[PDB]
Amino acid sequence: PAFGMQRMHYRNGDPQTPFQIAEQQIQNFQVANWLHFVNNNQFRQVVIDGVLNQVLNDNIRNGHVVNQLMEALMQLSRQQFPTMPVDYKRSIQRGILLLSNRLGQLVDLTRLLAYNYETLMACITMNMQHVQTLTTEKLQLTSVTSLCMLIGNATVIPSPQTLFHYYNVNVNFHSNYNERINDAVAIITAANRLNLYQKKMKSIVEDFLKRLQIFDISRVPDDQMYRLRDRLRLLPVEIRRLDIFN
Amino acid sequence: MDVLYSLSKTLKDARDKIVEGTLYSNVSDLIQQFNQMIITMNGNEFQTGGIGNLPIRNWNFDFGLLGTTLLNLDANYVETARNTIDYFVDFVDNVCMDEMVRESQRNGIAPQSDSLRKLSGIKFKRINFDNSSEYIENWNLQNRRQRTGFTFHKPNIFPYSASFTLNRSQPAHDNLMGTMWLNAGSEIQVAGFDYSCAINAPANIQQFEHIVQLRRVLTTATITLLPDAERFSFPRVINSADGATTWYFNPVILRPNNVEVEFLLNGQIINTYQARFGTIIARNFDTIRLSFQLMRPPNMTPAVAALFPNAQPFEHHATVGLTLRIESAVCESVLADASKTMLANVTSVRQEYAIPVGPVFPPGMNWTDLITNYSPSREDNLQRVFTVASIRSMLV
Amino acid sequence: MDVLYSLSKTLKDARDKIVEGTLYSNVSDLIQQFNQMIITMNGNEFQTGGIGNLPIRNWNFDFGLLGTTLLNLDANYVETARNTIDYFVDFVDNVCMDEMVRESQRNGIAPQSDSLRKLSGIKFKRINFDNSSEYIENWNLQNRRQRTGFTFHKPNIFPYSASFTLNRSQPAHDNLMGTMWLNAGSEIQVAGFDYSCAINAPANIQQFEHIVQLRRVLTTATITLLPDAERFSFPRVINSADGATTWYFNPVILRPNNVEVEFLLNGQIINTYQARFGTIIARNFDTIRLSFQLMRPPNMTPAVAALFPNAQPFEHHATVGLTLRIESAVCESVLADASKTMLANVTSVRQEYAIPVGPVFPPGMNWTDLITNYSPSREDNLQRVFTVASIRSMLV
Amino acid sequence: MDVLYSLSKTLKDARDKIVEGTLYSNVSDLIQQFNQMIITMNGNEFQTGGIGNLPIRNWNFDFGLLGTTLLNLDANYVETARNTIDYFVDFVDNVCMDEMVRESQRNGIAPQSDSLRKLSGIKFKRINFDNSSEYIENWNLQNRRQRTGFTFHKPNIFPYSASFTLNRSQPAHDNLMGTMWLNAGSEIQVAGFDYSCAINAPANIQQFEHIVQLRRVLTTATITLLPDAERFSFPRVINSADGATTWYFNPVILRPNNVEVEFLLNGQIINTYQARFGTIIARNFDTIRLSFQLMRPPNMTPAVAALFPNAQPFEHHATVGLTLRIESAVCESVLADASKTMLANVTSVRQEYAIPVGPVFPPGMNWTDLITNYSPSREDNLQRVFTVASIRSMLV
Amino acid sequence: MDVLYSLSKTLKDARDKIVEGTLYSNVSDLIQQFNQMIITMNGNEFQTGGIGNLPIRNWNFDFGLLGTTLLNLDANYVETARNTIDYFVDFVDNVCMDEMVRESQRNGIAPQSDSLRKLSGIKFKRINFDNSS
């Protein structure tokens, strides 16, 4: 509406997102460049100390890209909105300026969020695998508005004790996960090599999932249980347990 | 054609008017027209070339509109518009070249290239806007069958022909009477020569006539008529009519006598000029009749009387002349002329890409051959290619 | 240059469109552009310098904006606009004159006058609007390094030179063989003469060749080629090559034999025409090679055989000719032509104010000397002054 | 060109800077530029090579980006980047080859290949970054039309020419006087010989002149001038002017007298050096005029007197000589030179893939023909291909 | 000399690196150096002398800072930077020419032209950066 363009008739399932189409369809450099960044700002993958990590663009980390955002939406405050009622147009432009005039605060907020993310990601021990989950975390955009419009200039960073506690919890969970995998694999392999054909690996897998402390085993689909059984069967036994079994 | 011309005109206006620092009020309508062009052309695939050495080129149009709000144009606006205009100008140039190198015996006025045929669909009519050029204006008028007029400075209306007619001749070619002419471009030189200087002619007057049939009717024509034909006024060794031998011509120029220039239309005398030299006007004509007499001077000084003896040999041959130059004219049909470059443009495009000789135009677009046999199909194809050439010249 | 052209264009539009009784909707955008020009120029002091006899003139701008209240323009509005437009037109004309009378060897394409140098500042970019003239279009294209093009009618591309070359000569000048040519403006007349009429030629053929090297590459050129050279077809008394004596030329015109007109670019044959006369197209060339031959007629009537004996004296000298006129052409560099008045304007301005000879142009603004040594510096300065001349002629 | 150069520069910097163990602060900006290049090229289809034997290659980009938070790069990071670098290097090399093998008479400076033409789209301008090479800097300045030049060591400015001119000669070629020269690369060797040793010359001085016209203006040139032409200092058997016979040359070298070297620009004397040998500076010139003299030794020892008798036969022929080597120069136009490999690269690419001869460059990319007819169109195309060749050599 | 070289190097880097479409990360340090040069040179009067036929030229510096806050440099940025760079390059070239035509028997290693002597003051040392040639 700001640029007088015909409203996009976006078709769901399109390989392009609405912003990816708008980037090509909008000629203004400020808005087009901001749209390009938004389109291409996915997580980057990097292995640090053997742990996969989802890292941000360096422009997010330093908060410089917010300037571009400001630029883009500053242009939106100057646009004509050809066929829009002038009162509604004024309200939109003044809201755009409300967000625009907090450029310094938003740069600070972006840098703070990125720094907190990096610092707390340093304390992650298991690979940060990116998958689209079944259920999501609902984020109210009113909360985003609150954060954007209320953030001041007081830096808050994770306490050293908070970082150590987070790292310890991650390490404990990872170690327990590996130890319970080892126990399940050892018991399954022992039952198979002992020729305990009536032994049910379903109970072993259920015990393994229970000892992970975060699974309500009553709600695990059967296909996933059997897939877990198979994947556990394919693993090799840990050296100490295997030697004791020998 | 109108859609192609509108594309070219919009691009020319965008180049000329979308400049850094200019007020947006100067281009608001132009920006709307440019955006309409973008909308109409978006999502269309075009192909050009494939004839002769003209390369095959594919064009896909996916461009955003210009909708930025400004008081004065800045570098960003100009650069974006420049990128879009560059792509569109390349496309239009290639389409024009593709259409210029094509012809058809039937419906040669209709588009030949598939790109222009696609552009002739109804969905593209939105691109159409101001059609102010002479060639596009004539195209639209002829589509409406209103009278069309192309104004030519020195029209190329006469095919080249340097010929002669011997009304009296013999194997020795020593006592000849006849006319020799050059009809080239807009110029007609004619010279009637008598070797005997009308010694034995009735009333000592010899009569010469030159009839030149124009291939198309010329209107509002400005002509310059001059007594002497300087081309046929010096000694000359001319080939025989059949080339078997060569004869000698040794002019001594006498002023033409009883000069009548008749400009005829359908054999009817539209304009007549008697002993009038200088600038004359022929308002509507398709034939020129130059009739002039060689009159033996009744009174001669001894030097003059020495040149013309009673009998042979005739060492000096009396010659009267006429020069006729069409400075300007108006023709309903297209023609080459000295001020325009459409024939040159089409010929250059066809020669550069080694276009094979087609079924309409003569090889190499030889203008003399074209105008000698300026058939209606040739006229239609020539008008089409000339309009496309002007459209291209607006940009390239 | 673009700002100066924009000023001149705005003033021309104001003169043409601000007329009594006209609707304001017919001038709304024009009034806005004129007021933008007023705002931009207001508060600036300019000086047009005193080179030569040009008076030193000081210009101050403190003009109020044009009104926007009248539905239809009236006499009072037109008179106020006339006063403002008259002052601005005087300023623009004086600036154009001050620029035309200046030249530089180092940077000739850059502005030379302090007024145009001041107008090249960023603050004046607001004045810039539609650049639709051919000269300003070419200026903008050149600034961007794009293919430029100037269309000339009868381009003045050949420096004047009436010369001859005697391939065979002797002190008494009675048995001569050679060529004489005139290369003037768009015209080349050449004539190869043999006094012996190729009696002792290896095959009764005498080959003549004329090579004319154009100072700039010409494209899309329409050229009229005619057999005879009327200029070298009458008796002449010609100074010897050293001016020590004079020789007698008594031409008898024979038809040129095996005429090959070649249009060459970088020594490569771009176009070739064999025995073709009339209108031809040279699409892209920088050299013209005209090859013709004097062929002794194998068969002669008694008079023709009487002209050409087997040995000296040779009283009638065989001559073949060629005429080549460039009716129209396209050149990337500026040139003088028969239609545009840019060279005349620049020369008139220089002569009127007695501008001292500079380091670039010949000391008369003489076109022959200029086109002879058409250096890149000369080309840049000529383009600058011609563009300014067109800008001035928009008003004056 | 700027986008292609930016691709090549980004890949070169990726090879150089993305190394195992390097601090991420050393490559943060480089990694950002590399990721931008990946982002811009992703989802785009390219096609290169349909000319000569250059095979059709299709390029698709779906590469992942690089990490941005680690402290020191490790072998894993380099391994991840290497495959992308290899694919992009191959793509850029093929694009450069495709562009190097193309030319156009109309717009030689514009991209010719489909791939480089697509890379001229606005969306790829984001890939553009530091343009610091000499050729790309000159490209950008010349696009803006700013005074810029290339620096050459031993510029290849003189087309090969081994010739002689005989001012005095006769069928037996026993008493000759004239000059013989070799013009090759940056070297001029000239030698004026007199068989009589100026016995009958006024003041016993014989004057020789050599004028060499450069096809482009050289500036800030360092020249080495030496008083002997070792090329024409030994006995030779030389073909006559028309090849009818052969003549004998038996030089005896006398030092040149009154040596004057004039470096001229548009006929204006810019630099003059009299009796100066060694290093001289020619600041700005397009013509070299070497004037030297042979003077008879007024006093001769018995052997020297025996060399030069009073009359024929002349068995020893007195020769003076000059050698002029352009060590380095600056030229606004591209030239081949002893240091760069641009001409070699373009020629190698064209030969390896049997590129059909185009309408701009001489077949085989012959440098003598190229510099003999160094037209503006040839200059445009040569600058384009040379810039592409430098871009390619950045990687290949 | 080091300050003059730094001016020339900054201008060369600005011409090479400040190109339309380039990421601002490619020029962040360059833009900081350019703004430092602008701040240092602003408010200073320079005069390149009339020795020989070399014209007397007066140089005044009042330029605004190059902008930050662009993700990718656009055409307006490049145009403004080009205007400033053109003026600075002309000044630097004239100063270099003025210095090249002067000599002294003693203290010939020191700057000879008034412009380079002024540039040798302490207040211009801020302009100094990478000396790699």
Ligand SMILES: [Cl-]
């Ligand atoms: Cl005319």
Ligand SMILES: [Zn+2]
């Ligand atoms: Zn006959």
Ligand SMILES: [Zn+2]
């Ligand atoms: Zn005319």
Ligand SMILES: [Zn+2]
């Ligand atoms: Zn003579």
Ligand SMILES: [Zn+2]
């Ligand atoms: Zn010889």
